[PDB]
Amino acid sequence: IRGCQSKTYDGKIFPGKGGEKQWICKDTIIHGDTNGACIPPRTQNLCVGELWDTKELLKEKIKNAIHKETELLYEYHDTGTAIISKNDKGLPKGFCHAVQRSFIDYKNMILGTSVNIYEHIGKLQEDIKKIIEKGTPQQSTENVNAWWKGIEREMWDAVRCAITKINKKNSIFNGDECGVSPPTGNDEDQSVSWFKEWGEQFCIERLRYEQNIREACTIQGACKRKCEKYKKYISEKKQEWDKQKTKYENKYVGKSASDLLKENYPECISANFDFIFNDNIEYKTYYPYGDYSSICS
């Protein structure tokens, strides 16, 4: 199975069995030259125009990669199988986000500034960084950065002109719906883009739990099964938040993890981060379900 095919990082598309990817938190991170604490299920499902020549050809074998990626991203978000694409009782919910996030992994991939993975893809950072030298002058450390900088607009169009190949199907898709320009600001650092991802995902699922608890508690019974499956989710998640959360506040002197996530995603507002994942032992006694022990009582 090779050649960019329908995403599987949050299970299989309707009606697929599953085979869902999860976050990979490699403890092997304690240096300022690492990408991110934990790796998103989406970076792992990145589409790739064969990253198992020259610089003029290399370009195209990436412009098109992003093009394919963006399409699959519309698929996986249109249907509603991506964990963040899900609604509750123009372009798909959380489509544009996922779109960008994949644009960054590419940028960092090409520049070889990523979280050294899969080795057929991490391998490629070599294939790139070395093809340039026999592409342009100087001897050049920041030689690859420069080449990319003058193509980001071309690569971004490999995104801008893909949203367009949707327009009529389902029009108002002039391709700037996801920004007329590629991500920047805090996203100019893969570590942050991934962490912000983790946050949008969590908060949405968290809202997904309250909508199950609330919509099933109108004491005991089922409104205890749903509650248990929650403390469960925080149980599994506690590890990933702490790893990530810590990495951020150290690297970026004096900023807070919870503002970052609450600053960017509406679903995260109704969620007190240091409280949901609180340290103290007694809390696992005073609040057996956490922030939802209200709805669970």
DSSP states along 164-229: TTTTTT-----S-TT-SS---GGGGSHHHHHHHHHHHHHHHHHHHHHHHHGGG----SHHHHHHHH
Dihedral of alpha carbons 128, 131, 137, 141, sign: positive
Instruction: Tell which phi-psi region holds residue 144, choosing left (phi > 0), alpha (psi between -120 and 50) or beta.
Output: alpha
Method for structure elucidation: X-ray
Query: How far is 250 from 37, CA to CA, in rounded Å?
Result: 12
DSSP helix/strand/coil, 156: helix
Homologous superfamily in CATH for domain 47-177: Duffy-antigen binding domain (1.20.1310.20)
**246 C-beta neighbours (distance < 10 Å), count:** 12
Is residue 147 a contact partner of residue 132, using CB atoms and an 8 Å limit?
Answer: yes
Q: In this structure, what DSSP letter does residue 118 have?
A: T
Which long-range contacts (C-beta less than 8 Å, at least 24 apart) are formed by 17-23?
21/45, 23/198, 23/240
Q: Which residue's structure tokens are 């694409």?
A: 85
Two tokens, residue 4: 């960019």
Structural domain spans, the chain: 13-46+178-297, 47-177
Is residue 43 a contact partner of residue 121, using CB atoms and an 8 Å limit?
Answer: no
Query: How far is 13 from 238, CA to CA, in rounded Å?
Result: 28
- Best CA proximity match to 106, nearest among 136, 142, 151, 164: 151
Query: How far is 71 from 124, CA to CA, in rounded Å?
Result: 23
Q: In this structure, what DSSP letter does residue 92 have?
A: P
Dihedral of alpha carbons 4, 91, 60, 46, sign: negative
The CA distances from residue 223 to 32, 207, 211, 294, in Å, are: 45, 16, 12, 12
Query: How far is 27 from 33, CA to CA, in rounded Å?
Result: 14
**Sequence-ordered alpha helix ranges (H) in 111-182:** 124-131, 143-149, 152-163
Q: Which backbone phi and psi does 244 adopt, to 5 degrees?
A: -55, -55
Model resolution, angstroms: 2.8
**Who contacts 254 (Cβ-Cβ below 8 Å, separation ≥6)?**
none
Q: In this structure, what DSSP letter does residue 39 have?
A: B
